[PDB]
Each structure stands twice: as C-alpha cells, then as structure tokens.
Design a protein around this ligand. Structure first.
Ligand SMILES: Nc1ncnc2c1ncn2[C@@H]1O[C@H](COP(=O)(O)OP(=O)(O)O)[C@@H](O)[C@H]1O
Ligand SMILES: Nc1ncnc2c1ncn2[C@@H]1O[C@H](COP(=O)(O)OP(=O)(O)O)[C@@H](O)[C@H]1O
Ligand SMILES: Nc1ncnc2c1ncn2[C@@H]1O[C@H](COP(=O)(O)OP(=O)(O)O)[C@@H](O)[C@H]1O
Ligand SMILES: [Mg+2]
Ligand SMILES: [Mg+2]
Ligand SMILES: [Mg+2]
Lengths: 49, 443, 447, 442
C-alpha cells in the first residue's frame, strides 16, 4: 500500500512517455521516471513473492 | 521399424456424438452393444460427480475384452490416469494383498498441482561469510552463510546462503569463475561447468568448460505438473532421498514397502481440499482394470465387498470368461464366472457377442493392413474360413508366417500355397490333441 | 465436510434416526425403516456413551443389502468425532507378517482411546538487544538482554549456564524467540518483519512472525487424544511413530502391555489421563478362523474390552478352519456371549423411499412413473441394482439432454445392462460359449 | 469404576483351612470345586512341588474363567500370574515352542531386597584435613575431608578419606547444592541446587531441589521384583548408544529369536549365586492356559517333556471339552482333547451347572455390582428365562434393561421393560430357529 501510492502517482505523471522506449531513449529526466516505475514494480512483486 | 503386438489397430470406441456405435470404426467392426455400454461408462466417469460404481464384462474368449479395455483406456487419454492389473499380480510376498489393492485403488485417482519456483544462474567469484563488523559481545564474527555475488553477465547480487546450499556448493568444489545454478526455495546447486575463460588455463581438464547461459539472474517459472495420489502416498510414508548424509542414512533405513495408515491419507485429503479451495490443485478420477478375476481368493472378494463402500473407491471395470465355476478359495461356492453373488449384487453385467463370417473377413483384412501386408482374395477367403472353424487367434498368429513364406519366395502377396504351407508347418489345438490321442509315449 | 464429498454407497445417511425416547421416525435422518433395528442400535449407542460397563459383543443378522453396514455406519456417524471408532474386516486380519492373535490385539487396542492433558509454562517475548561483556571481562560476564512484547517489556539477566545456552541457538536480537520457564530451553521462532528486506532471497529457516501479545510468560494446558495402541507402538520402539505410519509394528510383546496398563491406571488415579469408550465393528465376520474366535472369546472378558459389532448374512453354514457347520457360520461359543439383532428386507414403500433419497443424494431428477418402474425393478431385482440402474439412466438422460430421466431412458438402460437373473440365464443357455469349470469350451462357431 | 462380567469375584471365599462358605467372595455353589481350588492355592503358596499340572472340565457357562480369576486374586499381586491361550502359541515371528518357553519362564519371578545407608543434604562446608605424610615431602598431605551436610531438622559433619576428591571431581559440586552420599561404598551424587537459591537468577534452567526431608543420614530399604523371563531378555537383548551394534539394534526389525539354553543355565546359576547369599529369593508362578483344546499335539508333547523340569512351576489348564478328536490326529479321540499322557500327569476337576436359586443369587449380585436394583417379579422372570435359555443371555441383559428403565425414567426395572428387553434381542436358540425358518440365506 505504501509503495503503489508512489507507483500510481508516477504512472499518472509520466506513465505514457517514460515507459515508452522512444521518449526514454533521449530525455534527461523521463528515464528517471521510467526506472523509478520499474524499480517500484520490482519491489512490489518481490514483496509479493 | 513398425512394431505391432496384437494391438494398435484400435483407436478407442470412437462412438458418435449421439452415442450410437457405427458398424466399422477404430479397429472395431460391429459390436454395437458393448461399445455403446462402454461409451455410457465413459459418460459415467466424465461426470466427475459419482464414485464407487463398478462393472464386469463377461463372455467367451477371443471376443475383444482386452480390445474394449484398451479402447476405453485410449479414449480416456494419458491425462486421465489408468492402472492395469492382472489377477496373478495381486499375490505378493512382502505384504498382504489388501495393502496392494488399496495401493492400486489410490493409484487409480490423480491430482494435478500448480507450483511456482525461482530460477538463478551466473558464475561464482566470492566465497566469504558475513563479515559482521559489529561483534555485539556474542559473536566471534563468522557464519556458515557464505555471501556470494552471483556474477551473471546481466546481473549480480550478494546472497546470504544457507549452510546446506553452501555445503552443496562445496560438493561441487567450485572455484572462482564458474557458472552456477541455484534455487530460492530448495537451494539446489548444479553447475554446467567451468567457464570458457579458464579453458586456456589447462591444456587438459576433466571439468567441462562451458559458456554462461543467457538469461537474467532472477527468473520465475510456474509448473502445473500432474502427480498421482499414491506417489505422494509413498513419498509421505517414506522420504524419497537427499544429498545430505542424514538423508542418506534415513533412506538407508527402510526402503521396503509396508502397509499405509489412513490418518496420513486423510490429512493429505484435507490439505488437498484446502488447495482446491485455494485453487492450487484439481482432482481427477481414476479407473482400475483387473485381469482374469476367476482365480481371486474368497478373502479378496469379501474385502472388495466393502472396498466399494468407501467414498474414495473409483470406478473399477472387470473382465471374466467363465460359466458355472466355483469361486477360488472356496469349496462349494459355485456361481457364474466364479464370483460370489454378494459382490455381483452391486455390479452391472455386460456380455460380448460372437461374430459372422463377414466380421472375420473384416478383422483379417484390418490386421493385414495393420502389418502393411497385402493378400489375395482367395487367400483371404481361406484365412477367414479356417479362422471360423479353428479360431481367430490361430489365423492371427499364422498371418506373419504366410507373409514370410511369400517373402522367401520373393513374393509380396500371400497366396493359397502360402497358407497351405503354413498349415503344413504348424498345427492348431484341435489336431494337436488329435495327434496326442494316438501317442506312443505322450507324443 | 473435511472428508471427500464423493458419493459413497451410503452418502444419504448421517447419524441416527432416533429421538430422545429412542423412537425412530419412519423416514428421517436419511435412513428409512428398521424401526426395531434402529431402536436397538440407539440402545447400544446410548450404552457406549454411558461407558460404565464393557466386555460385551453385539451382532446383526440379515440378508445382503438389508442395511447391516448402513446401520453400522449410521451408528458410527451418530457417535461423532473424538470417540474412537475402528472399522476392520475379517479378511484383512490374516497377516503374513503379523500373528492373527497379535493383529486382533491391535484391533482391540485401537478401538479404545485415552485423553491426556498437559500444562506448559514458557516465556514468550521478542528480544530487543543483547549485550555480553565477552572481551572486557570475558568468561560469561552475566550480560543483560532486553525482551519486549506488544503489551509489556522487561530486561532479563543471563547466567553463566545461560551464557552457554545462548552460545548455542545463536540470536542476534531483532528476532522472536521463546524459552521454557522450567527446562530453560530456548526456541528460535522467527525474526521480526523489519528483517524481510535484508536480502532478496532467504532460505527455509528465516521467518518473520508478529511480536507475542500480552504478558511475558504464560500458562496453557494442552489436551491430547491418544489411544492405547499408538502408545504401545511408541514404547515398543525407540521411534515408534514411523512404525505407526508404516505399520511395521514388529509384533509388540505382551510384556510391555501390562506396564502400559499400569501407567494408564496411574494416570487415571492421578487424573492426568482419562479413557474414552470405543466401538469396534467387523463386517462379514462369517468368514473367520477358529483361532480368532477363541482369542475374541478370551479378550471379551478383559477390562479393556470395547463393544464389538459384527455383520453377517450367512445362514447355518460351515466355519472356516473347521469341517463342520454352525449357525450363521459362527461357533456357538461366540453366540453364547452375544446379542443378535434381526433385520429384514424393505417393502415396496420403503424401497421407493430409498430410491428417492438415493436419487436426491445423486442429484438425479426423476419422474413419478419412472420412479414407479424403478421400484418395480428394485422389488423384482435387488435394491442395490435399481440404484445403479438410475445412476446409469442419469447419464443416458443427459445424453438425450432432456432434463429428467425418462421411462424409455430407464428401459434402454435396463436393456443395455444385464441383471443378475438375465446374466445367469445367458450363462446357462450358453454354457458351451463360456469356459466351463472343467476346462472345456467350444471355440469353433461353424458346425 | 468399570468391569466386564467380572470383579464380583472376591478371592475364593474360603475360611481358615476349613469348608468354604456357601455364598462367599461372589461365589455360589461348587463348594467342593472351590475347596479343591483353595487346596491348589495352598499348594502354590507352599512353593515346593515343581511342574504340577491340573485341568478343570465342564460345559459352557460353568465359570471356569471366573474360578481362574479367583486363583489370580487369591494369589495376590506379589505372586506373578501369566494368563495364556492356545491361540497365541501359533506365532508367525517365531516357533510355537519358543513362545511356550517364554510364557513358561514368565510365570516364575525373582525378588531382591537391597540395603544401603544414605547421607544426603545441603553441603554447608567443604574442607580438607591436611597432615604429614610418612615419607618426607615438600608437598602437602591431606588425611581427611570434612563435609558439613544440612538436611531437614538436622545437620551433620562427616570426615572423609581424601579419596573422596576423585568422586567430587566426577560430580563437580562446590557449595549451595544438595548432594547424595552412601556410607560404605563412598562416592558422591548430585541431585540439584538448594531451592532457596532460585531467586538469585531471574532466568535459569536448573531446577533447585529443596532441603531433603529427615535427618542427614538415612538407611532405607530397596525391594525389587523381576521375572526370570525379563532377566533372560535383558541378558539377551543388546544395549548401547554409540557402538555399531547399538544402531544395528535400530535401522532394522528387532525380532525375538530362540534364546540359547546356555544363557538360561547361566542366569539360573547367577540366580543361585544371589539367592544363597540372601539377596535374591525365588517364588514360583503359574501359567493359566484356557481353551487348551485349540493347542496341537506338538504343544502337548512339549508340555509332557517340560513338566519334569526343576524350574517348572505349577500350570493350570482350562477347557470345556470332553470326548473330542485331538487336533493333529483325527483318529486319536481323547477326553477334553488333551492326549491321555498329559492327563495321567495332571489332576482333573469336574464342574457342574448352576441351580435356579444359584442363578437367582448370581442375578441379584450382578445387579448390585451394576448398582441397578431389580424387583421380585422381574428377578423371578429373568431367573426363569435364564434357566430355560442360558446363563449368559440372562447375565448380559442387565445393561439394556437398565438403559431402557432409564429411558422411562424409572430407576428400577418392571415387567414390561424387561419384556421389551427380551423382545429386542434374541439368544442363540432363537437365532438358530429363525435361521432354519428363513429361506432368504439369513
Ligand atoms: N469385435 C472385434 N473387433 C475387432 N477386433 C476384435 C474383436 N473381438 C476381438 N478382437 C481381437 O481380439 C484380440 C484380443 O483378444 P482378447 O480380448 O485378449 O481375448 P479375450 O476375449 O479372451 O479377452 C485383439 O487383438 C482384437 O483385434
Ligand atoms: N436405512 C437405509 N436407507 C436407505 N438405503 C439403505 C438402508 N439400508 C440399506 N440400504 C441400501 O442397501 C445397500 C447396501 O447394503 P448393505 O447394508 O451394505 O448390505 P449388508 O447388509 O450385506 O451389509 C445400499 O445400496 C443402500 O442403498
Ligand atoms: N461361583 C460363582 N458365583 C457367581 N458367578 C459365577 C460363579 N462361577 C462362575 N460365575 C460366572 O461365570 C462367568 C465366567 O464363565 P467362564 O468361565 O468364562 O465360562 P466357562 O466356564 O463356560 O468357560 C463369570 O462372568 C461369572 O459371572
Ligand atoms: Mg483374450
Ligand atoms: Mg455390507
Ligand atoms: Mg471359563
């Protein structure tokens, strides 16, 4: 619960371009959002495991 | 190349969607009643609601009881478990027959289990325990938990490893720079071998030099493997094995089979019910088939009288080929097919039928197609005739010698001369007893 | 509900159909009729519940399919759980590895059960920190460890022997452990949830349970339902539980049986352990050996003799092990110390009610005239045959897909599957077709 | 408070070497039979004659097993009593001969009485008594060890030769802990710390024993009883914890083999060595074998061979048989199924059925034991039906009668209640009659 708050905030903020390979290829801060989303999902499913 | 042993000509009952059996289908010619009853039994078993039912098949030999049993087994499919059994197989020497037949009863039904595990791979560089810089006053800092950075080319992580998984690592005697494979839950350790980097170090080495398998460090896989009930029964009653010395001794203790108590079975049943509530597993029914039942001991009949009463009893199909016969293990207990009436009260009787000349011709030509052997019309007529007057089995046995006599004559077809020569070189039971009647010394 | 829901032979009967005054309703509880048999069975059940006297036997007399096994299992169900009920067969007792007398001894032992209670005093608490002066002073400096719970927390001194004890089962704090107050044995349960993120993958040892709630040390009594036979097994062997599961009892000698009986008496007079009345049931006892009969006659007079239930459909016939005959195929010595219950075949009303309740158990919807013709078959045939007929007719109907089982549906089901009478007629008229007893059978078809 | 058609027997119901009372010890009738029984019991108490056998014969419901339980009760728990049946002789694990031999050696029992002075209590003080060694030496020389011991309502200080230091090293006790000392053999034993020291440490695993009751020095008696069969098994079975034979005892199936005769003669020799010294004493037992008819001729021959032994105790035989074919040889028909060779070598007592007044007394005494009372009418009718049907049919109907009376809430039984009790359950004769009158295989 404490993690998917940040996960959904990030998804609503930059979930349409950070997850996109093209936008994340050349963007100073959009890849930061992309990798933060990947990391929070990874901790989410690892905690579930 | 192609091997055939009196079977593989039948691909199940192959009945219509309405349940009506057509004249010729799947190695079956005619025999509408038995095939329809067998399809009804298939409808019984596929209902997945009822248990404890049973049926016996009756009739004279060579009528296809084995054929029908194999047909129902085939149409059920490999996924549906099946346990073949012979009457002579029940009589064992280690434990009384009741345990063996309960074992078969449990073996009948199966259960598929959903499971998920974790996959890890990479080469090894680190063999260090937890440093534990803080002594805390209780630790001379050291632990049997070797922290290894799992050096895969795509990822690396330092793991606090159990003493058992590190002991298995020591079993492989791993050094720096070699691919390893470990499990999150079980901790199973297997190495594909040393890396190809160290291949040039030694001009020769028994250890195989292998490349690093491609893939991420942490990988997750799921299995829905189907395991029958009695494999779990024996595993629970007796642990299967382990790499450790304690497990070696434990499996060295008692490897022979003995009885199975019901308490463990009921606990397993309850945990399986918990799983099906969770949806992890789903049960499937079972079928048990017994061969040549007339010889069974009266004690076996009495016990099977109550075996079907149990809620865990699956459908058991039965075959017998006797008339007014006394029950084995008895003296005056005589009944049809040599079975006490108390058993057959709950059973259903189905009877096979004989066949007409056209049926013998059809089965003979189907066999000839099965062994890809071509025959002439006159030889086909002779085979069908002599099968009608002697037996189907004798004709089936001498089918191959006819083709062999054709081949040694450089002929691809069986002629009248071929079957005549086969009859010259082979004799059936009738002329066997005719010859043995006029015997100097039991010729 | 915990057992399999698969429909057994009698999945419609659950318990006993009697009232408080032991009067059976004509149709109740799932079993119909046998009013005198139901009342007698309830008398036996009430006496078992009483348990004041023992060393008695009871037998039921009736033809096959009359309800002997049905009544026995209904009595067992009405008995309920936690009361040891043992059901065995007269055939399985013939053990090639165990003596029949010894097997009967275990059969009697398993029927009776004992309840044993035990009180425990353990200290449960999550450890906060451990500080031992193992270097400044060394030699078990009697360090102090703090232990927390969700409601209270105290600091406990550690003695030299406690220093040595904590040297084993090493705990780095941040972990929930419990120590027995009496024996001082510490058990490491599992860490706190804060340790879940130390590493991604951990072995099967690390666990993260909640902090214990309440006071530090608590008192709790534990009651065990342990019958005599398993105690015999565990006392016979260093590890008797494996012999219990595998069944390799090894023919336990009777020398330890007197010792275990004396220990049971000591626990009873001390109040530590109490006994529970038990019921033993054997089906189709008509087949049995005379050694078993003599041993049963002997053991029926012992104090540890639970009520024994017999079922038999045999008339006056020969007993196995002897050449001569006897009533019920059973020796008169057993009949001397026994009470016999008579059961009879059901009438057409009882038969149709049984068919209706069995169809309801099978969840098979039927027609009125279909029920009438099924009852006609059941009265012409045996009762167990019409149940199978309607069972098969259910799938034939769903093949026809027209909801209820039809009249022509049952007719075709009967046509496809031979009755015992039709099977016997077919065998007799075609004895040449079948392999006769003598070993002669006609194989040729053409004449 | 439970019973099984028994426990109403109270011994033999005899008098001081006279004639037994007519109704004494839950007995009715058979005054001559139970007087002969008392003679047998006196012979057993004599513990002189060896290998004497006896058999009692009669019909069913004659109470032979009740009489045997009467011998067992009159013997007392001190005298071993080993019941046996001819069915268990047939053993799959081992031959019938060895089972017979072990049941034979189970009856005999050995008793040992042991004496030892005990010094016990809390160690108040420990000090050596230094002296001068006869040979000149610069090292110390202790001649005695003084220990201060404290028990309940008494303390004692005892001098000990300095050889007690080895024992105190084997014990590792210094102060504040209760110890165990014996007078002559010396040595030390540690039981636990003083109970008053528990408050010193909040948490500890050591249970602190209290101050021993009574004086510091005590002299108690040790009495132990063991059957010779148990001693045979102990001398035969291996024991160990680490040696290879120890877990060869495990990881296998421990089976009882035929004990070698040399072990039996050696244990007899050591029993003699401990009985002439007075430590041990031998009391003969008895083997009660009922339904001996079921035994085979081989068992009878081995009994004939073994009855002449000098460690052969009295053996009592029970059987309801008479002129019956012997098991093993169909042609040989002998009284009570036992071959006459044994019968000549044993004594025989005839048992007779019970009369109407005796059955009435049996019924009333059984009712009193059941703690359920019967009025005159039901008692009379139950006695009549027991006379006409059988003894056991009347005997076993008390529980259904009681529960049926309880259902109607009446404490006692009445005429219609017992009538219903007869109606529900049928005896052997009724069962046979309905068997022949039923054509439905019943
Ligand atoms: N109706 C049939 N259609 C086709 N093949 C049949 C038929 N009846 C018997 N067979 C043949 O009989 C063989 C098996 O005989 P089997 O059933 O073992 O004899 P039994 O009748 O003594 O059990 C099979 O190879 C099968 O080809
Ligand atoms: N009280 C009852 N109610 C309903 N069905 C009964 C009852 N008693 C017996 N049955 C029928 O009898 C059959 C089982 O007979 P069973 O009692 O096992 O024979 P036996 O008396 O030889 O043991 C079952 O199919 C069941 O439907
Ligand atoms: N003297 C007696 N007084 C009262 N009851 C007796 C007496 N003798 C025998 N019995 C009864 O006989 C029963 C034991 O009979 P038992 O010896 O087993 O039969 P059998 O002698 O026919 O083998 C006991 O339950 C007891 O009630
Ligand atoms: Mg065949
Ligand atoms: Mg039954
Ligand atoms: Mg007797």
């Amino acid at each position: 619960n404490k993690l998917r708050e940040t996960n959904k905030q990030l998804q609503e903020e930059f979930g349409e371009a950070s997850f996109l390979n093209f936008q994340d290829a050349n963007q100073y801060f959009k890849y930061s959002n992309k990798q933060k989303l990947e990391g929070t999902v990874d901790m989410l499913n690892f905690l579930k495991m | 190349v192609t091997r055939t042993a009196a079977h593989t000509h039948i691909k199940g009952l192959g009945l219509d969607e309405s349940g009506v059996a057509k004249r010729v289908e799947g190695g079956f010619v005619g025999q509408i009643e038995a095939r329809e009853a067998c399809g009804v039994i298939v409808d019984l078993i596929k209902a997945k609601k009822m248990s404890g039912r049973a049926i016996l098949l009756a009739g004279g030999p060579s009528t296809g009881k084995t054929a029908l049993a194999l047909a129902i087994s085939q149409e059920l499919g490999p996924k549906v478990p099946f346990c073949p059994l012979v009457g002579s197989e029940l009589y064992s020497v280690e434990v009384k027959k009741t345990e063996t037949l309960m074992e078969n009863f449990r073996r009948a039904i199966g259960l598929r289990i959903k499971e998920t595990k974790e996959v890890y791979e990479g080469e090894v560089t680190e063999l260090t325990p937890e440093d534990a810089e803080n002594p805390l006053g209780g630790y001379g800092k050291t632990i049997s938990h070797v922290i290894v950075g799992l050096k895969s080319a795509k990822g690396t992580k330092t793991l606090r490893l159990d003493p058992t998984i590190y002991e298995s690592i020591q079993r492989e005697k791993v050094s720096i720079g070699d691919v390893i494979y470990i499990e999150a839950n079980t901790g199973a350790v297997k190495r594909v071998g040393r890396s190809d980097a160290y291949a040039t170090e030694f001009d020769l080495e028994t250890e195989e030099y292998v490349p690093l398998p491609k893939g991420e460090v942490h990988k997750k896989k799921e299995i829905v493997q189907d395991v029958t009930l009695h494999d779990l029964d024996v595993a629970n009653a007796r642990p299967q094995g382990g790499q450790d010395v304690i497990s070696m001794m434990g499996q060295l203790l008692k490897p022979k089979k003995t009885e199975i108590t019901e308490k463990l079975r009921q606990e397993v049943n309850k945990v399986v019910a918990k799983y099906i509530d969770q949806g992890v597993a789903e049960l499937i029914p079972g079928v048990l088939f017994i061969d040549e039942v007339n010889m069974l001991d009266i004690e076996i009949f009495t016990y099977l009288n109550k075996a079907l009463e149990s809620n865990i009893a699956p459908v058991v199909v039965l075959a017998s080929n006797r008339g007014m016969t006394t029950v084995r293990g008895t003296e005056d207990v005589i009944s049809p097919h040599g079975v006490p009436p108390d058993l057959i009260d709950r059973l259903l009787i189905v009877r096979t039928l004989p066949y007409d000349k056209d049926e013998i011709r059809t089965i003979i030509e189907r066999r000839a197609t099965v062994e890809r052997l071509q025959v002439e019309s006159s030889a086909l007529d002779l085979l069908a005739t002599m099968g009608t007057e002697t037996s189907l089995r004798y004709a089936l046995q001498l089918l191959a010698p006819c083709g062999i006599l054709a081949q040694t004559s450089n002929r691809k077809e069986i002629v009248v001369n071929d079957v005549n020569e086969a009859k010259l070189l082979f004799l059936d039971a009738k002329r066997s007893t005719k010859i043995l009647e006029t015997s100097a010394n039991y010729l | 509900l915990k057992s399999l829901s698969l429909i057994a032979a009698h999945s419609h009967i659950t318990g006993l159909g009697l009232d408080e005054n032991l009067q059976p309703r004509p149709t109740s509880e799932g079993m119909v009729g046998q009013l005198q048999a139901r009342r007698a069975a309830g008398v036996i059940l009430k006496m078992v519940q009483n348990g004041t006297i023992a060393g008695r036997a009871v037998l039921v007399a009736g033809p096959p399919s009359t309800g002997k096994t049905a009544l026995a299992m209904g009595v067992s169900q009405s008995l309920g759980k936690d009361v040891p009920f043992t059901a065995i067969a007269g055939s399985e007792i013939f053990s090639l590895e165990l003596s029949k007398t010894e097997a009967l001894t275990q059969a009697f032992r398993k029927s009776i059960g004992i309840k044993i209670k035990e009180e425990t005093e353990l200290i449960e608490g999550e450890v906060v920190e451990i500080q031992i002066d193992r270097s400044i002073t060394g030699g078990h400096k009697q360090g102090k460890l703090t232990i927390k719970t969700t409601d209270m927390e105290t600091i406990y001194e550690l003695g030299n022997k406690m220093i040595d004890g904590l040297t084993k089962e090493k705990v780095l704090a941040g972990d929930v452990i419990s120590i027995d107050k009496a024996s001082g044995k510490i058990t490491k349960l599992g860490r706190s949830f804060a340790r879940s993120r130390d590493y991604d993958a951990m072995g099967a040892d690390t666990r993260f349970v909640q902090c214990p709630e309440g006071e530090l040390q608590k008192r709790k009594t534990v009651v065990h339902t342990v019958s005599l036979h398993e105690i015999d097994v565990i006392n016979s062997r260093t590890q008797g539980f494996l012999a219990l599961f595998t069944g390799d009892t090894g023919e336990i000698r009777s020398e330890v049986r007197d010792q275990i009986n004396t220990k049971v008496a000591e626990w009873k007079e001390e109040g530590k352990a109490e006994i529970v009345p038990g019921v033993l049931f054997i089906d189709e006892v008509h087949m049995l050996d005379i050694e078993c009969f003599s041993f049963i006659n002997r053991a029926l007079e012992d104090e540890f003799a639970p009520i024994v239930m017999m079922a038999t459909n045999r008339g006056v016939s020969k007993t196995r092990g002897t050449n001569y005959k006897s009533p019920h195929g059973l020796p008169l010595d057993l009949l001397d110390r026994s009470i016999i219950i008579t059961t009879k075949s059901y009438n057409e009303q009882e038969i149709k009610t049984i068919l209706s309740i069995r169809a309801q158990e099978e969840e098979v919807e039927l027609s009125s005239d279909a029920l009438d013709l099924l009852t006609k078959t059941g009265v012409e045939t045996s009762l167990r045959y019409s149940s199978n007929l309607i069972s098969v007719a259910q799938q034939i109907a769903m093949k026809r897909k027209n909801n209820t089982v039809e009249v022509e549906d049952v007719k075709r089901a009967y046509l496809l599957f031979l009755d015992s009478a039709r099977s016997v007629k077919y065998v007799q008229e075609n004895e040449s077709q079948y392999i006769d007893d003598q070993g002669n059978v006609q194989i040729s078809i053409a004449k």
